[PDB]
Amino acid sequence: GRDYEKNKVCKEFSHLGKEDFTSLSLVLYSRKFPSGTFEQVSQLVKEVVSLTEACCAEGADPDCYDTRTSALSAKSCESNSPFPVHPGTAECCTKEGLERKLCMAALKHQPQEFPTYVEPTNDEICEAFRKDPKEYANQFMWEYSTNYGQAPLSLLVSYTKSYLSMVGSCCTSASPTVCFLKERLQLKHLSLLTTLSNRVCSQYAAYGEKKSRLSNLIKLAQKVPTADLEDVLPLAEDITNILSKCCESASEDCMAKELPEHTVKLCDNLSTKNSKFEDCCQEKTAMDVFVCTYFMPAAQLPELPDVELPTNKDVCDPGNTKVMDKYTFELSRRTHLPEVFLSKVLEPTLKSLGECCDVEDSTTCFNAKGPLLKKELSSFIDKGQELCADYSENTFTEYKKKLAERLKAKLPDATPKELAKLVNKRSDFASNCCSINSPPLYCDSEIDAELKNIL
């Protein structure tokens, strides 16, 4: 049948060469399997390349590819398989033939919300490079790609190649320190683009377009609570659109090309709205402006007027979210609660209001759920603020001390030991889910568990 893939591979193999093809494959599979060990991914790459070389060789077999492939898939199905697998793979292996290749081909991976990559010292880099340059390069490509796998493949290929050229030059230099200093500066732009794109796209992948859009509106409102809806909404729309496009594009510079115009609109709109945005807008490059905008913490929210839940039929136009957006914006600008919490409760809430539009009697429905939703919401917010109490306005060590006192009030008979464990568990939760850029997937599950916690 269609040997589309067979040809695409053979052409790459021939065009790039076995070595460069192996490297490309290492990066590709490393971003595909974020939790795959260096050993597993290397093995998979070995067998993939080994079958490509054979199946593409003159006088192999009309169907060498499919045969060798099915063999790989079969191998990833065996217990203690040498290959890395995606969650739910075991399920796919209970099926056969058709379902097999299809089921597994569908399986996708989650983004890495906790990167652990840390560039070693120049001394350490060169020490490992000289001992075994091949191993160094392989381990680096695997580690970098599994950590920043949501950045585009071509970008990861380009940055890792450029990084390894730098290590190659500077570690054979008579003046390593000077060489590294100079080269890192030249790669700085590419370095930031890769981590920046991986992070924003990991969040986008975790939320999906609708929740990402709402997420960006919430964050923007918490950063400039003194601005008007018309100041931030367009910006929230714009970045979401940029994410929808670049995070799903194979182009290595899609993000680098979209941000310049985005940062112009953001600064034209916000540079005079508050001090933090004026500072961010004084950054030298667009990426630097964006990055600054990104790390900006939720500002000390002004206690503006209360905002009533939109229990009106005017929220029934699917092609119109103006009333919902305004509500979101207004609730976010005044509530001291992290976006990870707000995004979580606003989804069910705003939806619950939906199950009241197309019904026998709307006004009666809205007035029926109104108190119910309002009650649930305040409860969620209250508990969320309690869970994150004292975390924002204190150092971590001072936060822990105030936390201990709070816990002592609720647990009069608790021993120092058990109080220590609770302080540890709670401060640990706060350090991960009580800030503006807390990881959505990790916190979603942690928040559910904490919300039912009596402490």
d(CA 294, CA 277): 11
Beta-carbon contacts of residue 391 (< 8 Å; ≥ 6 apart): 399, 430, 431, 434
Beta-carbon contacts of residue 399 (< 8 Å; ≥ 6 apart): 390, 391, 427, 430
Beta-carbon contacts of residue 190 (< 8 Å; ≥ 6 apart): 155, 158, 159, 162
The b-or-e profile of 382-404 (16+ CB within 10 A means b, else e) is: ebbeebbbbbeeeeeeebbeebb
As its CATH architecture, domain 312-388 has Orthogonal Bundle (1.10)
418: its two tokens: 């058990």
d(CA 374, CA 141): 50
d(CA 120, CA 112): 21
Q: One-letter amino acid identity for 147? A: N
Burial-class residue 148 by CB neighbours within 10 Å (0-12, 13-18, 19+).
buried
Count of Cβ atoms closer than 10 Å to residue 42 Cβ: 20
305: its two tokens: 């007027």
In terms of Cα–Cα distance, which of 167, 184, 156 is closest to 124? 167
In terms of Cα–Cα distance, which of 112, 161, 141, 149 is closest to 42? 141
136: its two tokens: 């160094």
* CATH 1.10.246.10 domain locations along the chain: 4-108, 121-208, 209-296, 312-388, 395-454
Q: Is-contact 423 444, C-beta < 8 A?
A: no
The total number of residues shown for the chain amounts to: 455
Q: From which experimental method does this structure derive?
A: X-ray
Which residue's entry shows tokens 């995606």?
86
Q: Is-contact 357 315, C-beta < 8 A?
A: yes
Q: Radius of gyration over alpha carbons of the chain, in Å? A: 26
User: In 25-137, which ranges are E strands?
Assistant: none
Q: Is-contact 384 337, C-beta < 8 A?
A: yes
d(CA 381, CA 451): 10
Q: Is-contact 138 42, C-beta < 8 A?
A: yes
Instruction: Report whether CATH 1.10.246.10 matches the domain 395-454.
Output: yes
d(CA 108, CA 91): 14
Half-sphere exposure of 294 (CA within 13 A, CB side): 20
d(CA 17, CA 32): 22
C-alpha distance from residue 208 to each of 63, 215, 240, 262, 428 (Å): 39, 10, 10, 20, 27
User: Torsion angle, CA of 205/209/213/219, rounded to 10 degrees?
Assistant: -10
The topology under which CATH files domain 4-108 is Serum Albumin; Chain A, Domain 1 (1.10.246)
C-alpha distance from residue 165 to each of 22, 87, 217 (Å): 17, 35, 41
Q: One-letter amino acid identity for 21? A: F
Q: One-letter amino acid identity for 421? A: K
CATH number for the 209-296 domain, one of 2.40.160.10, 3.30.2130.10, 1.10.246.10, 3.40.50.300? 1.10.246.10
As its CATH architecture, domain 121-208 has Orthogonal Bundle (1.10)
